[PDB]
Subunit: 289 residues, 3 copies
């Protein structure tokens, strides 16, 4: 069986003083299509493969291609994936919950380098022999993630730096905890990164959270992001403040709102301020199909 | 929801004295697949996105890729589209009705340069930051089209030439009228083009029409195309004559026929003669799926 | 109507002493998706077109694109195809039946050069104007195949070498016979190749066969492959020995097994030895969807 799903999004993206001769505001858009092939068996083992075709405004050649494949096998809550896998640091819960706006961005997200599912081809040839193995296990409330990525599997191992990551999250109705650790993240020796986050659903409508990161070899240093959101019916308000160790850096912050127009149609906007005082704003829609 | 539709066509394409060392007759074919994602809402607003994958004989690398995305929002007969949009000059009725043969060609089509939906990627990088906005409105019988195309939206506007076009067509059971105007067509300063056409369904089986064009900065100058067609059951006969202002140019003309083999299967052929006395002929099939 | 089908496969691929600085064992995988558009008519003539998107580990740019189109028309058991066609030498029965392992490989396959359906684009530009015509006819038990491939249809014919091939196979419940002949195979002048094969289903569970090849201008010279397989329920055991004329060459051989895990899920493995004493082994799964 083969199924297609995806989303489209478009709106205005503003970055103050974007560049000399450049327009500060542009119409940023993305079309994403996922192609998923699945083979179910009566033994209870499911096999699957997926390909992604994603286009973003500004893409080279004004064209769209597929990325590298991901394959998996699931059985009893355990899933083993091979190829262009999802990594533990990128998969844990809470880590991206400060994001806002129609482009789901946040200066409060981790400021480190690490491997993650690649949505597109890479013209540089860097990903040509990139191959990962991932294992996930959902043990009611608790989720375990494990990933190993070999940036070039054809070359003798001792010559390449592989990334290994572990992550776990747990949640009940009002408290959520998450942690992750990755060594040689992004295939960079000694770029060991860590994450610890907690959230409290202090209501049926609101949640506040705190994420802490060890950004490894990043110039940002350690980071702390405090975020929260509150739902007033169909509209959700979001905000966050983030601080990094980098000497002289500013406190990043953002405020935004989401509006659930209909099932699968979300209108969002935000105004944010970065660590180097960058001012960014956006307003657009995302529709799922 | 995601739906796929498209067509395939193949046949013989002949151009007399095509070139030294070249074959005059080749097997020309095209495969077109449209991928459309739609999100309907109970509020009556529909959202959609589309991608096209088209291959034509002779395409570089013997491969097929997708083009740049188009997004739209429809509500009450009004549709607003963004990205790789359909333009007013290319969308009005009547303007392409002289076309014949399985490749739907005609020297009687406008001999000017203007932007239109891009079916494929562009290796030159010219379309990388190309973005348009289009608005259409169907007011029973009357159709309004509006388009604005910015060839490079990231660059300061005063530095780039944007194309703006307006078009309208109206029709009852036997008369049709259409007009269009585009300034800086194709992003070429002062390349202002215009179209005025009328058709008369002098029967249930036949129609004759007259299209007039102001080809802007084209060497063709003004143009007049007289065309007509008549249906004898499943077979339709077509013909046209076209004249351009260019000094020394010949009168272009063509004769062809269509045969509706079955629903979605059309066999067509034509023999045409161009403004520079080019002789072209074709015979093939188009099947829709 | 448009339908998608395909398969995914992954496993371990081992080649002893693969290269200096290289890993002998890698995780080799492939994702194949076929897009087929069909137009059925009440006259009993079916039209179709197909595109393939295939990705294999190691592919350049870590991306996936479509290949060149194939079109066809079927009526009363006769099918005429145009474009990226399947060729007679590659389509006859028996010729690939010695293949084993999850990657369906065999040193016993013909060691010659010939054209065949192209699953992917070609960055070299060699396939840009490649066009073939194929005709097949199924006359109960007997299958006829005919193919003509013009490597560059735009260039004067006398300047290019076209490939022409004929093939036929016949089978009843226990005996199968197949033969094929192709002149200027692969567009190489005088590279005339031939195949003759026979198989005997000496049981409901086992079959033994013998394939003989004239490899044309290949250094292999004539070749003989003796193969057989036997099914013990869900597991099938396979083996083959192959000999080529090339002076000093070793006898190639392989042993492998298939395990039908469920409908559409096959686990396979093999250990093989080549003509130059290459030792290869593999173990993986193929799942169809
Ligand atoms: C300097 C900006 C130049 C481009 C024109 C700006 C006005 C564009 O909006 C109109 C068309 O729709 C496309 C953009 O999406 C904007 C609105 O937000 C999405 C729906 O709320
Ligand atoms: C195999 C799937 C098709 C993907 C291949 C596209 C390869 C294009 O690059 C070829 C070399 O030229 C370099 C292009 O510049 C960078 C393009 O990518 C960047 C923006 O998305
Ligand atoms: C010329 C700039 C155009 C692009 C950016 C527009 C940016 C402004 O929108 C910001 C929205 O976020 C504001 C806060 O939301 C709080 C709650 O009230 C809204 C309830 O739906
Ligand atoms: C100089 C031409 C060289 C190629 C061979 C010419 C004969 C080809 O037609 C046979 C195969 O079908 C493919 C082409 O479509 C032609 C017929 O028109 C379509 C159906 O009416
Ligand atoms: C990103 C989607 C894949 C589209 C990218 C293909 C890019 C190929 O070009 C890379 C640079 O090389 C130049 C090729 O020559 C022109 C090819 O296009 C012309 C015929 O259709
Ligand atoms: C060697 C050249 C091969 C490719 C071109 C073939 C061109 C000839 O076909 C032209 C058909 O148009 C003729 C006029 O149609 C008029 C009506 O009668 C047909 C009714 O179905
Ligand atoms: C030197 C090899 C380096 C990579 C790790 C080897 C172990 C890999 O197998 C585990 C993950 O699944 C992916 C590979 O498929 C192998 C098993 O065969 C398929 C199912 O029987
Ligand atoms: C038009 C469909 C997209 C296919 C075009 C990809 C063209 C990429 O090549 C552009 C020129 O650069 C040469 C690349 O090196 C070889 C890539 O292919 C080999 C491995 O599969
Ligand atoms: C380190 C090498 C890893 C990759 C290669 C593994 C190769 C070994 O597997 C070979 C299997 O073929 C053996 C013969 O099968 C005979 C029948 O018994 C099996 C019944 O299901």
């Amino acid at each position: 069986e083969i199924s297609l799903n995806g989303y489209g999004r478009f709106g205005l993206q503003y970055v103050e003083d974007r560049g000399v001769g450049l327009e500060d505001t542009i119409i940023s858009s993305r079309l994403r299509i996922n192609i998923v092939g699945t083979t179910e068996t009566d033994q209870g083992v499911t096999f699957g493969a997926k390909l992604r075709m994603q286009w973003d405004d500004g893409d080279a050649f004004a064209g769209t291609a597929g990325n590298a494949a991901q394959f998996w096998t699931s059985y009893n809550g355990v899933t083993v994936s091979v190829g262009n896998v999802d990594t533990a640091f990128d998969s844990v819960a809470l880590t991206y919950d400060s994001e806002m706006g129609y482009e789901a961005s946040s200066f409060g997200d981790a400021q480190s380098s690490f491997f993650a599912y690649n949505s597109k081809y890479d013209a540089s040839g860097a990903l040509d022999n990139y191959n990962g193995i991932a294992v996930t296990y959902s043990i009611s409330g608790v989720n375990l993630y494990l990933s190993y990525v070999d940036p070039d599997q054809t070359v003798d191992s001792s010559l390449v730096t592989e990334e290994f990551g572990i992550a776990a999250d747990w949640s009940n109705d009002m408290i959520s905890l998450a942690a992750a650790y990755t060594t040689d993240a992004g295939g960079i020796v000694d770029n060991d990164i860590a994450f610890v986050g907690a959230a409290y659903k202090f209501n049926d409508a609101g949640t506040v959270g705190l994420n802490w990161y060890d950004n490894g070899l990043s110039t940002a240093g350690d980071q702390v992001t405090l975020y929260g959101n509150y739902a007033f019916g169909a509209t959700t308000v979001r905000a966050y403040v983030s601080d990094i160790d980098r000497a002289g850096a500013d406190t990043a912050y953002g405020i935004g709102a989401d509006y659930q127009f209909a099932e699968g149609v979300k209108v969002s906007g935000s105004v944010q301020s970065g660590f180097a005082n960058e001012t960014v704003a956006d307003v657009g829609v995302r529709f799922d199909f």
